Amino acid sequence: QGQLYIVPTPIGNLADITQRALEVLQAVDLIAAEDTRHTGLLLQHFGINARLFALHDHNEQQKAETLLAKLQEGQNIALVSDAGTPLINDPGYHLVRTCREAGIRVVPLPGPCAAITALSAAGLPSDRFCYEGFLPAKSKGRRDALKAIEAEPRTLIFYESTHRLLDSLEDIVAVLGESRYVVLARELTKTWETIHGAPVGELLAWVKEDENRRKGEMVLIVEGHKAQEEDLPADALRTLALLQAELPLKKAAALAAEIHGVKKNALYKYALEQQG
Amino acid sequence: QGQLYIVPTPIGNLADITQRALEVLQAVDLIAAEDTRHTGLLLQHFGINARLFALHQKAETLLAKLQEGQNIALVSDAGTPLINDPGYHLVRTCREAGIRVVPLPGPCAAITALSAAGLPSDRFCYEGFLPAKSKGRRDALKAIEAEPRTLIFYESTHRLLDSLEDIVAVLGESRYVVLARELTKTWETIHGAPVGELLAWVKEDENRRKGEMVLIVEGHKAQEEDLPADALRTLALLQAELPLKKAAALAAEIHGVKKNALYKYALEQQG
Ligand SMILES: CCN(CC[C@H](N)C(=O)O)C[C@H]1O[C@@H](n2cnc3c(N)ncnc32)[C@H](O)[C@@H]1O
Ligand SMILES: [Mg+2]
Ligand SMILES: [Mg+2]
């Protein structure tokens, strides 16, 4: 019977909270939080007292049923995360789905979002964009993920940690090339806030100039691929290379052209250039 | 020497304004908005006076003012500014001119709708307003039919029925769609259901299509198992050339299909 509230929290600047959020927090009986201690400190700063429930992804589903039962009893539950808004790389998906399928009102509240905040000042097209969150921590997985989105024409939003910023930048340089334009937004809404846009190679070089520039939390905005059709499809080239490894060059090119339905002369020229 | 500020505005709830935004508005001596009337009404409700600037080149004037040393705050009618509209060129020019841009967190209709829709969020794409023309809308839907990420669109009450019919025609009926209406207000309503069921539900009453809407559509992540004729012909061609096992592996890696299936199919054909 009681409604669930998705109340965002500041992303580092306490002053960046909404009045409605404070009223809702003081008007609810239980607050599901990623880390009770953290939220507890935030509540104390505003002089708000309420019950805290440890709700994180590890025990999300397990306690989703308990939260649903509590809501059915007429209680009001507000969901908060350490920062930004829940459900965006933060726990809450299973609980929200269970509440929705059980016929429970869900009241979302506007609030801070690191990706949106970075995009607003990114200086890049915002009409269409794709959010991807964190990148794989492994080199092979990261390279595969980057390759899969190499041809994406929309602006790309990624989340990044100081622990792997240099490796991720190097992988981006290797895959997407240094010509791509990338914007790094660090410590938004904080004293050391800094947004720097540049070619990937230039960006990397600038970051390596000082360790201070890769400290804290970061968001990466990658300009989408340009609308150039001169380059032939990469899948055809990969198939041609694999068939060359397994079969003779001429048969490999003929089979690749036949399956992909592309001109054989261009594929043969590319293969000859690669071999040379 | 001046600093540009991005100050998101409420989206239909005056209580959704943050303290930092109010302090920034007081601090800046010139506020630039697209719709002067809306921002003026917001300021009067908050009892704020300032030198409003109207947007319609204005980029050069704003850059000159910023270079002079005047703090300018950029605002929009609702939500976060410079989203689904031009203006990012000005931010890029200011960054290239040594100016410092301070974004402020604020309301976002798409993010707010996504946080409550319950559809997957680990990865999503925002497509903004769909084409107002039926042919354009159908072409856009076709271009994103195979997208596996959750899609977020903005729609107006005028074309909500047309958009729903277009999605029904293109994406079919089995697809799950969530409609968010009048978020952050007494009329807020989020309803999730198949496209056809949602269309019937919205047609059942007129108030359900009143205002501005946010549409969240789950990506295509089902019925991906099949045996395309291209894979079969490739396997047949490679079998005569390479050993069955090698041909099956090559076909599987080319078409991204299970190798063991192709092998069983080849054996059944041979049999
Ligand atoms: C792009 C122009 N945009 C401004 C929102 C801002 N740009 C933002 O990013 O949040 C206007 C569009 O956003 C949607 N919208 C705004 N407020 C809404 C609300 N309370 N409920 C539902 N939808 C809403 C709706 O589709 C409207 O036509
Ligand atoms: Mg922790
Ligand atoms: Mg968290």
Curated annotation (Swiss-Prot), chain A:
It is an enzyme of class 2 (transferase). PROSITE patterns: RSMI. It catalyses: cytidine(1402) in 16S rRNA + S-adenosyl-L-methionine = 2'-O-methylcytidine(1402) in 16S rRNA + S-adenosyl-L-homocysteine + H(+). GO terms for cellular component: cytoplasm. It is found in: Cytoplasm. The keyword Nucleotide-binding does not apply. GO terms for molecular function: rRNA (cytosine-2'-O-)-methyltransferase activity. Keywords: Cytoplasm, Methyltransferase, rRNA processing, S-adenosyl-L-methionine, Transferase. InterPro entries: 4pyrrol_Mease, 4pyrrol_Methylase_sf, 4pyrrole_Mease_sub1, 4pyrrole_Mease_sub2, rRNA_ssu_MeTfrase_I, RsmI_HTH, SAM_MeTrfase_RsmI_CS. Belongs to the methyltransferase superfamily. RsmI family. Catalyzes the 2'-O-methylation of the ribose of cytidine 1402 (C1402) in 16S rRNA. NCBIfam families: 16S rRNA (cytidine(1402)-2'-O)-methyltransferase, PRK14994.1. This is Ribosomal RNA small subunit methyltransferase I. It comes from Escherichia coli O157:H7.
From Swiss-Prot, chain B:
PROSITE patterns: RSMI. GO terms for cellular component: cytoplasm. Keywords: Cytoplasm, Methyltransferase, rRNA processing, S-adenosyl-L-methionine, Transferase. Its main location: cytoplasm. It is found in: Cytoplasm. The keyword Methyltransferase applies. GO terms for molecular function: rRNA (cytosine-2'-O-)-methyltransferase activity. InterPro entries: 4pyrrol_Mease (IPR000878), 4pyrrol_Methylase_sf (IPR035996), 4pyrrole_Mease_sub1 (IPR014777), 4pyrrole_Mease_sub2 (IPR014776), rRNA_ssu_MeTfrase_I (IPR008189), RsmI_HTH (IPR053910), SAM_MeTrfase_RsmI_CS (IPR018063). Pfam families: RsmI_C (PF23016), TP_methylase (PF00590). It catalyses: cytidine(1402) in 16S rRNA + S-adenosyl-L-methionine = 2'-O-methylcytidine(1402) in 16S rRNA + S-adenosyl-L-homocysteine + H(+). Disulfide bonds: none annotated. Its EC number is 2.1.1.198. The keyword rRNA processing applies. Belongs to the methyltransferase superfamily. RsmI family. Catalyzes the 2'-O-methylation of the ribose of cytidine 1402 (C1402) in 16S rRNA. This is Ribosomal RNA small subunit methyltransferase I. It comes from Escherichia coli O157:H7. The lineage of its organism: Bacteria, Pseudomonadati, Pseudomonadota, Gammaproteobacteria, Enterobacterales. The gene is rsmI.
